[PDB]
Unconditional design. Structure first.
Lengths: 254, 92, 301
């Protein structure tokens, strides 16, 4: 609310496709139109040619004469957004005029870099506040209802980035002395995603000092059974090592 | 190139005014155009279902007479012509 | 018949009779005689055969006078073509293109303007010569309006250089010509002359400039080996997974063929809902996303 300046046009990709024009919404339109606007939004303002956008929306088999289709999608964007916010060069399309804080993705990289800098500087309160602001950026599933295998690619990429971001958040929560909300979040995420080894290692680390041992190794045994049933291999050596040092109960990491 | 199935291809025969006949393939889904060039002499190809000139006149370049029409009028044409015949009779 | 056909052409011009005023106005009158006579011949009306032959004689005389006017005016076109020589086009080719301009010029002449042929012909000579220079001199073709824009910019840049004795910034030239600076950068990037591939490097003679350049289209054997090993390893890891999972992933990205298929497209041959097919698909992506089956593909990018 403190960064809501006059004339600000805010764009959002981490949650669904929406536009905020000084507090009032804009109709982003068709799902393919939403995917087109998102594809322009991921490229931080390239002039990207018509064939590349056609491939981004659809992939291997776009209809043959659908170049005029993308043309009229561009017309839709130009009449629903500002005339000058979208400009065309040599047949390519480009959204400019994006200030700081206009895109939630740019704010996400900014907050991640600030958290990394604070971790390098050894600060904890400012980094915790930065990642608290960062976890409020995503709203539900990223890229809600957009077609295209391209959109699937940045969907899985942003999901993986969110996974490492929450891994770092939970890790600093564990090292600074937070366990209750930590184990709550880890249990919720392992309920959501059952086949991540790193989050279950985080479960072991969090429960190891919060006063919980039986269900931690029960969850580990369930992980071993599912990983043997679905993969039939052995887990990472760092895991077995973490369970090992746990077993002799070293109070060094208290 | 392994396991890739090629698109079905059809044979369309093109004939030119000089009688040259050549066979070249088209895709089944692709539209068949009645207008094409000749592989032998580069002449216009015809005799593919329905075909025509389609205004082969192409606005032919203006001749000297067209430039002369701008320069001189009808009655001027008549009077210059008789003047030149008078020059002929004087010279003969 | 010898070398330097420029000398041979100049002697082939010969001692043509230069035309004083009454001579060329009489020749122009004979041009009109022949032209209007052949125009009368072009009509389909039936006249006396003797009159037709007389008009054909007038047409032949008009063609002869047109020729004579051409050999009378090859001197002026040579004197004008040398003004724009040594700029990427050959001197005799400039002469020939000016000859095209002159045969265009004389066709569009009338005797009503009692003026000499020089002041009317020189316009078409300069126009045709500069049009041919714009069209054919450069290896990459530049349209005539781009050529006139770029050489106007070049001449005003030279004027700026001789005025203030220093190299101007492109912004100054842009604002004094009322175009955008990026347009100026674009047009002076376009206005460039290619350098021939066969330039010698130095004292060595066998080493040429042409053997120093590589080609990006050349196939790298390492890249092809990596591609075929990626295909083999992808088939191996597909065989590693379950048969039904391998079948459903083989069609989602259309790995087996050249065409990918949607979830509704494969719901008829195998007969499951969209919910279940996308659930097992995402389960396959998650299983392949596990770090166990990653080192076999992470370095493969």
């Amino acid at each position: 609310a403190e960064e809501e300046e006059s004339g600000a046009l805010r764009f959002g990709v981490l949650g669904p496709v929406r536009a905020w024009r000084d507090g009032e919404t804009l109709a982003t339109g068709s799902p393919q139109q939403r995917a087109l606007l998102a594809a322009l939004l991921l490229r931080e303002g390239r002039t990207a040619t018509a064939g590349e956008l056609i491939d981004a929306l659809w992939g291997e088999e776009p209809p043959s004469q659908a170049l005029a289709a993308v043309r009229t999608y561009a017309s839709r964007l130009r009449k629903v957004l500002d005339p000058g916010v979208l400009v065309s060069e040599s047949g390519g399309y480009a959204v400019r005029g994006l200030a700081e804080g206009a895109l939630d993705l740019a704010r996400a990289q900014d907050l991640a870099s600030a958290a990394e800098k604070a971790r390098s500087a050894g600060d904890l309160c400012h980094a915790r506040d930065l990642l608290r602001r960062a976890l409020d950026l995503w709203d539900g599933e990223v890229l809600a209802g957009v077609p295209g295998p391209y959109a699937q690619t940045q969907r899985v990429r942003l999901g993986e980035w969110r996974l490492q971001l929450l891994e770092t958040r939970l890790d600093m929560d564990l090292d600074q002395g937070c366990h209750a909300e930590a184990v709550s979040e880890l249990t919720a995420l392992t309920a959501a995603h059952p086949l991540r080894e790193r989050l279950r290692e985080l479960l072991m680390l969090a429960l190891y000092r919060s006063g919980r041992q039986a269900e931690a190794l029960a969850v580990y045994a369930d992980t071993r059974r599912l990983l043997a049933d679905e993969l039939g291999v052995d887990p990472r050596p760092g895991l077995q090592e973490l369970q090992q040092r746990i077993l002799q109960a070293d109070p060094a990491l208290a | 190139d392994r396991g890739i199935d090629l698109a079905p291809r059809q044979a369309v025969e093109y004939a030119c005014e000089k009688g040259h006949r050549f066979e070249m393939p088209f895709s089944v889904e692709a539209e068949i155009p009645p207008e094409w060039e000749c592989k032998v002499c580069g002449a216009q190809a015809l005799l593919v279902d329905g075909d025509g000139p389609e205004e082969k006149k192409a606005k032919p370049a203006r001749t000297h007479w067209d430039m002369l029409m701008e320069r001189r009028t009808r009655e001027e044409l008549e009077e210059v012509l008789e003047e030149r015949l008078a020059v002929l009779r004087s010279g003969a | 018949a010898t070398a330097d056909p420029v000398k041979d052409y100049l002697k082939q011009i010969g001692k043509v009779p230069l035309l004083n005023a009454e001579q060329e106005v009489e020749l122009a009158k004979r041009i009109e005689a022949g032209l209007f006579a052949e125009d009368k011949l072009a009509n389909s009306d039936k006249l006396a055969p003797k009159l037709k032959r007389e008009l054909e004689i007038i047409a032949e005389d008009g063609r002869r006078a047109k020729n004579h006017l051409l050999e009378a005016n090859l001197r002026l076109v040579v004197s004008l073509a040398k003004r724009y020589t040594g700029r990427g086009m050959l001197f005799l080719d400039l002469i020939q293109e000016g000859n095209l301009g002159l045969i265009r010029a004389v066709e569009k002449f009338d005797y009503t303007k009692g003026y000499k042929f020089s002041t009317y012909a020189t316009w078409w000579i300069r126009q045709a010569i500069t049009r041919a220079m714009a069209d054919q001199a450069r290896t990459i073709r530049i349209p005539v309006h781009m050529v006139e824009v770029i050489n106007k910019l070049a001449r005003v840049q030279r004027q700026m250089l001789q005025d203030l004795g220093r190299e101007p910034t492109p912004e100054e030239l842009a604002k004094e010509l009322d175009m955008t600076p990026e347009k100026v950068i674009e047009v002076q990037k376009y206005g460039r002359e290619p350098i021939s591939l066969h330039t010698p490097l130095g004292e060595d003679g066998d080493s040429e400039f042409g053997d120093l350049i590589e080609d990006s289209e050349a196939v790298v054997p390492a890249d092809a080996v990596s591609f075929t090993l990626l295909q083999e390893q992808l088939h191996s890891v597909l065989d590693t997974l379950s048969e039904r999972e391998a079948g459903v992933v083989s069609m989602r990205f259309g790995l087996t063929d050249g065409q990918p298929k949607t979830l509704d497209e494969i719901g008829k041959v195998y007969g499951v809902t969209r919910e279940r097919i996308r659930q097992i698909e995402s389960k396959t992506m998650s299983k392949l996303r596990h770090p166990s089956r990653s080192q076999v593909l992470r370095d493969y990018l």
